[PDB]
Amino acid sequence: PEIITPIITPFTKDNRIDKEKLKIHAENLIRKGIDKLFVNGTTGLGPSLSPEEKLENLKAVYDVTNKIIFQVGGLNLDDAIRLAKLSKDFDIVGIASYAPYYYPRMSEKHLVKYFKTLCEVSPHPVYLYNYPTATGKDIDAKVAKEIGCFTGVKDTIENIIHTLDYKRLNPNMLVYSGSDMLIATVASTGLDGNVAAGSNYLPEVTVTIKKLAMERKIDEALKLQFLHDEVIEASRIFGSLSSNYVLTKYFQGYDLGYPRPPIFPLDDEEERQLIKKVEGIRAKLVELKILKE
Amino acid sequence: PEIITPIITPFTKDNRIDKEKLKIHAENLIRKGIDKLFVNGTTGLGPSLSPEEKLENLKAVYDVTNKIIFQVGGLNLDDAIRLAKLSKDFDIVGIASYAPYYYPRMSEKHLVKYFKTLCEVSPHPVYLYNYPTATGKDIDAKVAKEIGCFTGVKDTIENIIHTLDYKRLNPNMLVYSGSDMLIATVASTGLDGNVAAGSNYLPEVTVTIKKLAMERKIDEALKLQFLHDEVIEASRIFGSLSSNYVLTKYFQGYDLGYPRPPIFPLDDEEERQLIKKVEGIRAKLVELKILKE
Amino acid sequence: PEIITPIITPFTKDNRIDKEKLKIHAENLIRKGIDKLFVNGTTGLGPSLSPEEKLENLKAVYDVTNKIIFQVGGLNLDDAIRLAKLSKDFDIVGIASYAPYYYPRMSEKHLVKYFKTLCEVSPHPVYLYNYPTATGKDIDAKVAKEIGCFTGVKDTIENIIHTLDYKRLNPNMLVYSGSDMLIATVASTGLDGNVAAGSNYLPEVTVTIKKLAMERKIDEALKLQFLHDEVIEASRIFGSLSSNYVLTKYFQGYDLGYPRPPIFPLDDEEERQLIKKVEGIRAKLVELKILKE
Amino acid sequence: PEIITPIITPFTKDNRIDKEKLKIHAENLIRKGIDKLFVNGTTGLGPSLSPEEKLENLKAVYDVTNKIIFQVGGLNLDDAIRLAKLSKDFDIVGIASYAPYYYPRMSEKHLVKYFKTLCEVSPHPVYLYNYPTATGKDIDAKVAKEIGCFTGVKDTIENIIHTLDYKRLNPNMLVYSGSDMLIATVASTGLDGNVAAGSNYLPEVTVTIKKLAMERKIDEALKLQFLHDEVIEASRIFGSLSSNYVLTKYFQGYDLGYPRPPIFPLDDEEERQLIKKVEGIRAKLVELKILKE
Ligand SMILES: *[C@@H](C[C@H](O)[C@H](O)CO)C(=O)O
Ligand SMILES: *[C@@H](C[C@H](O)[C@H](O)CO)C(=O)O
Ligand SMILES: *[C@H](C[C@H](O)[C@H](O)CO)C(=O)O
Ligand SMILES: *[C@H](C[C@H](O)[C@H](O)CO)C(=O)O
Numbered sequence A, B, C, D: 001p002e003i004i005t006p007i008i009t010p011f012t013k014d015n016r017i018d019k020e021k022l023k024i025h026a027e028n029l030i031r032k033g034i035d036k037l038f039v040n041g042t043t044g045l046g047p048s049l050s051p052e053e054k055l056e057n058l059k060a061v062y063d064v065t066n067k068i069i070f071q072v073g074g075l076n077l078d079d080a081i082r083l084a085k086l087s088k089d090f091d092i093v094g095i096a097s098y099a100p101y102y103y104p105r106m107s108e109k110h111l112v113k114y115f116k117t118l119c120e121v122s123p124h125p126v127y128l129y130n131y132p133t134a135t136g137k138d139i140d141a142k143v144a145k146e147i148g149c150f151t152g153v154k155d156t157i158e159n160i161i162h163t164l165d166y167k168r169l170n171p172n173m174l175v176y177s178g179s180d181m182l183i184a185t186v187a188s189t190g191l192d193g194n195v196a197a198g199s200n201y202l203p204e205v206t207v208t209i210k211k212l213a214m215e216r217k218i219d220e221a222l223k224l225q226f227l228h229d230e231v232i233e234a235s236r237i238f239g240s241l242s243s244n245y246v247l248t249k250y251f252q253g254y255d256l257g258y259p260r261p262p263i264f265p266l267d268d269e270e271e272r273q274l275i276k277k278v279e280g281i282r283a284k285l286v287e288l289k290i291l292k293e
Helices: A019-031 A051-064 A076-087 A108-121 A141-147 A160-169 A182-190 A202-213 A217-237 A240-252 A268-287 B019-031 B051-064 B079-089 B108-121 B141-145 B161-170 B183-188 B203-214 B216-237 B242-252 B266-285 C017-031 C051-063 C077-089 C108-121 C141-147 C159-168 C183-188 C202-214 C218-236 C240-252 C267-287 D019-031 D052-062 D076-088 D108-121 D141-147 D162-167 D183-186 D201-214 D218-236 D238-254 D266-289
Strands: A004-007 A036-039 A068-071 A094-098 A126-130 A152-157 A172-178 A194-195 B004-008 B036-039 B068-072 B096-097 B126-130 B150-155 B173-175 B193-195 C003-005 C035-039 C068-071 C094-098 C126-130 C150-155 C174-179 C191-196 D003-004 D034-038 D070-072 D094-098 D124-132 D150-155 D174-177 D191-193
Touching: A004 A202, A019 A051, A019 A094, A019 A240, A036 A051, A051 A076, A068 A217, A068 B141, A076 A094, A076 A108, A094 A108, A094 A152, A094 A268, A108 A126, A108 A141, A108 C068, A108 C191, A126 A141, A126 C035, A141 A152, A141 A160, A152 A160, A172 C174, A182 A194, A182 A202, A182 A217, A182 D183, A202 A217, A202 B051, A217 A240, A217 D162, A240 A268, A240 C202, A268 D238, B004 B203, B019 B036, B019 B242, B036 B051, B051 B068, B051 B079, B079 B096, B079 B108, B096 B108, B096 B150, B096 D070, B108 B126, B126 B141, B126 C174, B141 B150, B141 B161, B150 B161, B161 B173, B161 C218, B183 B193, B183 B216, B183 C183, B193 B203, B203 D183, B216 B242, B216 B266, B216 C159, B242 B266, C003 C202, C003 D070, C017 C035, C017 C051, C017 C240, C035 C051, C051 C068, C051 C077, C051 C094, C077 C094, C094 C108, C108 C126, C108 C141, C126 C141, C126 D201, C141 C150, C141 C159, C150 C159, C150 D034, C159 C174, C159 C183, C183 C218, C191 C202, C191 D076, C202 D019, C218 C240, C218 C267, C240 C267, D003 D201, D019 D034, D019 D052, D019 D238, D052 D070, D052 D076, D070 D108, D076 D094, D094 D108, D094 D150, D108 D124, D124 D141, D141 D150, D141 D162, D150 D162, D162 D174, D174 D183, D183 D191, D183 D201, D183 D218, D218 D238, D218 D266, D238 D266
Parallel strands: A004 A036, A004 A194, A036 A068, A068 A094, A094 A126, A126 A152, A152 A172, A172 A194, B004 B036, B004 B193, B036 B068, B068 B096, B096 B126, B126 B150, B150 B173, B173 B193, C003 C035, C003 C191, C035 C068, C068 C094, C094 C126, C126 C150, C150 C174, C174 C191, D003 D034, D003 D191, D034 D070, D070 D094, D094 D124, D124 D150, D150 D174, D174 D191
Antiparallel strands: none
């Protein structure tokens, strides 16, 4: 199974993508063993990016690696098709899309038509990004089977039965969990890996969890998974999407600029409180030799 | 109380806004007794419009009327602030925003900041568009009070206790329900009216439910409310946002072109089946003299 | 429209029904203008009562009045049938049942059969007690129509569109809201009344809101409804079912003993903090001559 | 890890517990390798049982094996205390309780006090039965740690993150999933097993999944798990609690009488239809040498 990072998008204080900070982060993740990078995902604020900015993300990360799944979805199908077509010139792993968001109670037929349209124009394997809480609707294993053209799915949902059903109904699909908390379990249970937001700031931890689980060191894998869970939980206190920038600086040492408002940066008081929640974990990880310092 | 129309956005065959068609629709709404037009709302596919398109919509409708509430919200706060500022040379009723959508679990602090920012830059009264199911979060009476700068609220929620609480906690605030099914009830119970999607295609009915209820003719208001409910229900069969276009052409006699995919137009057969569901209702309304021929 | 009290079941210090206190409570409710008493409801802790105790509550209240709806539902259909049958010697308004609770995913067919079974053996008119949050299932206007034998419905739900639909789909059905916060609205919108927990302790307030709304004094009815809402809200702080006991003694001047654990009594401090939250309101109602003091 | 059966309670035509049938089923389960029996659980319709019937189930099952977890909870705490103190004379594994069900919005303090009360009187280890959808309340790993007296937990929830959390926050606690669909996964990931409704009718399948997973034959375990999932899905067509009876007689060859209405028995036609849905699965199981024929 693989660890895939939904890469954060660094923005400048002028609210533009900071390409040079993006490349440093991408080079580091690849160096520390991350298999592939998911670009324009939730963690990268994809829904806050214009199509031009989605493409800009791909270009900059493509300077570092071709190990990329390129998220192109949105509420203007013509723009999503254009991005899909444009990816022809990049030797990447796949494109992806979440379901059309915001609008409640979209028919099954319309949702299927949306995805099959992307498949029809896609010059690469197409990944489903299933995230019901964010998008307001579910594209479960049976609907995915009906769409019929997915190479893989990232299933972000608090229900592993739901995730296993993709494998059960679609044996040749790649099936990933969107949870950092499930890296040990997913590697234990025959699933294909994790697109793990926490691998932005602790790629070492997520890779080592997966390694230990593969080795069938399940108790050791769980011990480390449970320390990583505490960092995930600390990140959620002030808002994980914002906290991810702070934790990446803290653990990896380079910064990633600002998020894009209304995803606001943590203020000084919030940062201090976040660091006090994780510095002990950071000590344990250095002790364990997972982190250098 | 008032009937406000979240006006449909007509698109051409090639996915641009049909400005002349939008002006015809707007003019007919005003002439048929609609009080204001809520531009770039959900019914208008506001989340699917770039900021420039949001501005185009305001300019087209403004050629017809200044009775406008201009919705400017989005996931790029620099863009919504720009739209808010640009509205200064339009003598309109107000600007509006839904909450930042898609991203789950955004903090009270951050949501509060987003809306206080818009109010800080706004040259007009600001209206809250509260839509928990689409945006994934709720800006209730309490949070509205803490933001402290809203002139009015559109509450799209089935819970009328929730809507009544805006008035309870903010006595001066104008408070509209986002439901077509609650026109008689809103009018009876001391609230300020409805922002009603179905008034796009049946403005005569929604204006008449309001008036009946205003005159304490509750049984009659309800009779007509219950008829209108059947039309809402039929619009949901193939997708209300797509169905609104078909109903407007059917009931009002002019067309509004296409929605924007992934809000896909109904096909011929769905159009036919939709019309069959509402024929006998059209007939009742002609007979009641609410509609002509 | 009516105000109906889902009467509290006072328990003794050794966890038995206090018959004398229940008769004293029932006399006062009837004296103060309450229309009917709903016995073994949620407020009465019906699900915590054995079938014997549910009969005992009926016998006691019936000493005071004929104006009783007798709730008999439970997870043993034979006991519910037996309570239905035993009601034949009581000259009461009707019997009632919530849907079978606890077990999720019960089929529509098995739900219809449970209610049709009770209608088949009932010597009295049958009222639907619809409470989806408590029971885990919804018996909506269309399901009620399918069951076909309800004389009325109490709909405890935060969605008045849902409550209105009972009237729409079943024009002869009596339709009550289970909300205290909706007394002004329900009377202004053509529904039949409220089965209101808060009328245990403020029957005078509930009757007055209803009267003011009936007389079309909506702003007066709201002002009063909004004050009542603050009392409801205070009661939720430490748990409504437990607080109702404390409030009834505070406002009506007699003791109602204890709830039945695990609905635990308020402790001295909770009781003191609660009274502190409503004492300003008690003063205002005295000043308005709604409460005599 | 273990497979624990939440054993069905067989009822006679006249709605009493069929002791002899219960004993035969209990005996067969143990002989087929089931580790422990969970008595008066959801599958055994415990909320539909009086305290006297809960105790009668314990006595009959105790004739067969002492490997019993005795579920005692309900909405009368005195009766649950009584059942707990009565279990003193039985040399069994433990007692258990779900949270007080039906009543929404019970405070954490009241839920804690309910369980600690049962812990203070228990003559055996105490197990948490956590079932949020059925009871309306979640007693999560943090609340479990606060209560402080649980030897183990049965977590009936699809979110395995939530189940792993009990282990994380309470490392000495026995942690079981209530899902039949998570048997391979739970065994793989270092949890203690499953309390599986489907082990009533396919005990041999559930124990083999567990053993395959234990042997790290994940693909083989999943294959069998996926077949087992199809029987669970089939059981849900006409209602799982009712269907469990028909499947047990079908797969195990003896009958378990009747459920207790409103859990109504399947009819002849529904039985025929269910069997036709699982026939082909039975053939697969025979071909895999799990079942004889
Ligand atoms: C995917 C990873 C998950 O969707 C986020 O965990 C959900 O917050 C991504 O694109 O970030
Ligand atoms: C426990 C087993 C689970 O609670 C169910 O199988 C899911 O409803 C039980 O006691 O039946
Ligand atoms: C307002 C009306 C409601 O928001 C929608 O009708 C709900 O679908 C609007 O902006 O369209
Ligand atoms: C009816 C009152 C409402 O059903 C509950 O108070 C809602 O909590 C009853 O029987 O109490």
